[PDB]
Amino acid sequence: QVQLVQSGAEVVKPGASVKVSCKASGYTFTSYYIHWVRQAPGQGLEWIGSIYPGNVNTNYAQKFQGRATLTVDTSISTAYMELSRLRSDDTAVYYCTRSHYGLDWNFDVWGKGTTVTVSSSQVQLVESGGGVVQPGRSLRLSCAASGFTFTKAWMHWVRQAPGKQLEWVAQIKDKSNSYATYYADSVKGRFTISRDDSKNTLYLQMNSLRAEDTAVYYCRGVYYALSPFDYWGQGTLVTVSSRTASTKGPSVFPLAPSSGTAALGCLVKDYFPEPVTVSWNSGALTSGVHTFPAVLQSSGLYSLSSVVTVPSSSLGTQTYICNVNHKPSNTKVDKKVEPKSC
Amino acid sequence: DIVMTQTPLSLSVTPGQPASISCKSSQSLVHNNANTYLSWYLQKPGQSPQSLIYKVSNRFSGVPDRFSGSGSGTDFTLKISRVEAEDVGVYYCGQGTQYPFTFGSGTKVEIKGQPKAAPDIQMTQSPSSLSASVGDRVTITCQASQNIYVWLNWYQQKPGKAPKLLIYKASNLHTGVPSRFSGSGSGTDFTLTISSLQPEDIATYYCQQGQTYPYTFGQGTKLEIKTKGPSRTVAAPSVFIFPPSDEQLKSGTASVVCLLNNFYPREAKVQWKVDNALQSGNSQESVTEQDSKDSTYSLSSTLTLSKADYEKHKVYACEVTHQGLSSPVTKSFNRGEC
Numbered sequence A: 001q002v003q004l005v006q007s008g009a010e011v012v013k014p015g016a017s018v019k020v021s022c023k024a025s026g027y028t029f030t031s032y033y034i035h036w037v038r039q040a041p042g043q044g045l046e047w048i049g050s051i052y053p054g055n056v057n058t059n060y061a062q063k064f065q066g067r068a069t070l071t072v073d074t075s076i077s078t079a080y081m082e083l084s085r086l087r088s089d090d091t092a093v094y095y096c097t098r099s100h101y102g103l104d105w106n107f108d109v110w111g112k113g114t115t116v117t118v119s120s121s122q123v124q125l126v127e128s129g130g131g132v133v134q135p136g137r138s139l140r141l142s143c144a145a146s147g148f149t150f151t152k153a154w155m156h157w158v159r160q161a162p163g164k165q166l167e168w169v170a171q172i173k174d175k176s177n178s179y180a181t182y183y184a185d186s187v188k189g190r191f192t193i194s195r196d197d198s199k200n201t202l203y204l205q206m207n208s209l210r211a212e213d214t215a216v217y218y219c220r221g222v223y224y225a226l227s228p229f230d231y232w233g234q235g236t237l238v239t240v241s242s243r244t245a246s247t248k249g250p251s252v253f254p255l256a257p258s259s260g261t262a263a264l265g266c267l268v269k270d271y272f273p274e275p276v277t278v279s280w281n282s283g284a285l286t287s288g289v290h291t292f293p294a295v296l297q298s299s300g301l302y303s304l305s306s307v308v309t310v311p312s313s314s315l316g317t318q319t320y321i322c323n324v325n326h327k328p329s330n331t332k333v334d335k336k337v338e339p340k341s342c
Numbered sequence B: 001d002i003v004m005t006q007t008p009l010s011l012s013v014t015p016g017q018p019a020s021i022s023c024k025s026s027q028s029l030v031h032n033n034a035n036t037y038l039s040w041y042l043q044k045p046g047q048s049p050q051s052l053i054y055k056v057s058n059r060f061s062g063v064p065d066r067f068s069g070s071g072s073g074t075d076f077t078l079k080i081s082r083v084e085a086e087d088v089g090v091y092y093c094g095q096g097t098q099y100p101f102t103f104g105s106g107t108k109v110e111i112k113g114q115p116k117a118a119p120d121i122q123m124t125q126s127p128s129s130l131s132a133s134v135g136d137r138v139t140i141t142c143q144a145s146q147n148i149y150v151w152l153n154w155y156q157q158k159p160g161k162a163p164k165l166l167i168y169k170a171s172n173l174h175t176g177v178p179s180r181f182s183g184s185g186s187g188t189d190f191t192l193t194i195s196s197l198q199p200e201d202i203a204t205y206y207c208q209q210g211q212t213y214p215y216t217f218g219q220g221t222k223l224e225i226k227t228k229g230p231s232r233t234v235a236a237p238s239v240f241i242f243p244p245s246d247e248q249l250k251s252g253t254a255s256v257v258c259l260l261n262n263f264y265p266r267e268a269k270v271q272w273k274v275d276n277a278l279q280s281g282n283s284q285e286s287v288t289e290q291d292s293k294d295s296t297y298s299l300s301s302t303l304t305l306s307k308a309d310y311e312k313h314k315v316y317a318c319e320v321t322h323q324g325l326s327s328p329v330t331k332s333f334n335r336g337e338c
Helices: B307-312
Strands: A003-006 A010-012 A017-023 A034-039 A044-051 A059-062 A068-073 A079-083 A092-098 A114-118 A125-128 A131-133 A139-145 A155-160 A167-172 A182-183 A191-196 A202-206 A216-221 A229-230 A237-241 A251-255 A261-271 A277-281 A289-291 A302-311 A320-327 A331-336 B004-007 B010-015 B019-025 B040-043 B047-055 B065-074 B075-080 B089-095 B107-111 B123-126 B129-132 B138-144 B154-158 B165-170 B179-184 B187-193 B204-209 B221-225 B238-242 B255-264 B271-274 B284-285 B297-306 B317-320 B329-334
Touching: A003 A092, A017 A092, A017 A114, A034 A068, A044 A068, A044 A079, A079 A092, A125 A182, A125 A216, A125 B221, A139 A216, A139 A237, A139 B129, A155 A191, A155 A202, A167 A191, A167 A202, A182 A191, A202 A216, A229 B047, A251 A331, A261 A277, A261 A320, A261 B238, A261 B255, A277 A302, A302 B255, A302 B297, B004 B089, B010 B019, B019 B040, B019 B089, B019 B107, B040 B065, B047 B065, B075 B089, B123 B204, B129 B138, B138 B154, B138 B204, B138 B221, B154 B179, B165 B179, B187 B204, B238 B317, B238 B329, B255 B307, B255 B317, B271 B284, B271 B297, B297 B307
Parallel strands: A010 A114, A131 A237, B010 B107, B129 B221
Antiparallel strands: A003 A017, A017 A079, A034 A044, A034 A092, A044 A059, A068 A079, A092 A114, A125 A139, A139 A202, A155 A167, A155 A216, A167 A182, A191 A202, A216 A229, A216 A237, A251 A261, A261 A302, A277 A320, A289 A302, A320 A331, B004 B019, B019 B075, B040 B047, B040 B089, B065 B075, B089 B107, B123 B138, B138 B187, B154 B165, B154 B204, B179 B187, B204 B221, B238 B255, B255 B297, B271 B317, B284 B297, B317 B329
């Protein structure tokens, strides 16, 4: 039985690297080309490169030259793929595959694939909020900090109109400087920067928005002293436009189970536009889930319910969390759904 | 406002060659604490800025040694001793000496390559999806953007599984693949035929050119078969009612949700009664698509009221009429009890 057995699923942070393995069995490892091919969720197939284990000759797709490394260990008939400087769009199933004897241009035997997830939350700074807002109206951004001492840093917002240079927006200092704030002249009196050290969160409240405020907004954290840093978030687009309905992130309310089979769920309300994606227990719970089509309410905002049936035996032990993602507003909400206790 | 100007606007080098970038400020960047807060940043195409240099000449942790900054007063330079492929992008200087903080106008650094290669081969499959019947002859096609002679393979992939080679070199059946699969074509236009469709052939099919690196795949054709069987057995809905959460009541609005789970046939009636008064016009319904596996439906009915109206009434009920129920089923709650 000719087989390729792959290493297990991996969650990695952006900027880091990943190394997946592929053990060959049931044929002579050094006489056939090995390739790596990836499949981003929902999409098609993309060839990464190939290696001939007998003489370790390699060929890489140009977009992977300098970032992917294919290697082999012939003593254990194993091929490896390392991908460095991981970004957003490297999340995919990675397959190793073997060519038919004597050629390298087809993929005859396939591994079952390795799921590689580039985590969105394992970064120093990640912004929430954004989307479309009417001129004259308001919009709030937030930014979650991890992996550094938030409270000692001076935090900033910086923005970049499309095709333009970086422009500084605001700064807020630390508690030893009374959280003093500073603004660019064109936003003074309209924007407010704030921080919440206990939640490691930075905020930007933007009022009276103008077309000139349209830009990608970056949060930023800076510290000097004796181990300096200058970290940047991921950026979120804010479009001040009167020609598109405004975006709104959802509120999520629990549908607690009643006091055989039990049903519980999440009510996902007050967002615009479509879509939201709903998962349960970060995707661990899928059987018995029904997410209903969204309906537009008289307020002009969508609402839907996601429900799951479970055995009532489990309402004690099992934890139930619905995960709501609304890309147009760049917001994510988790709500634990627990039995109401009297 | 301290203005930061950069020169050049853009530059190009061959890979591995050096680049120099200059920044000029409209006033001295020396802070009163004798520090010069001049920083350098790289913004790779489509990404966030990343910090390279602070206080004129110091590298941040992990910044490679090939980046160096120098200068003083109003004139500053960033030298890249070797421009590697991942160093391309827009470089910005910035000052933190005087409010408002400002950034330079940016210098774009690119790699000029005298050799231009043949473009990647693009594979386009037709149709995007199709629905067919057991026993049908099915043909799907692939068009390549360049002539690839016979160097074309076809694969089958079912959800959650790895692709499986069906045909290689345009027309050769791989070992173990049933003979109802065949391929034809040469040049730019290729065809995969299934002589008589079988239920296990539901899948996405991909073509792949094997002529020139990089090897490239088509975007896929989804092949569906709609089931030609009778109706499933009648399934009564299980019914659940949910009061508004106390979280939502803190918003002035109350939503009451009635769930009808996994019923068949589709016809079902849901009535709401508040204090045993029938309601009309203040509820919305939403129905799932017929389930893939058990062919049932599911339904939510949501009743909306103001918090003020919700708190004035005691008992909330949804009454469900469905063929699988011997009589209408009522699920209710009494506001305030557990």
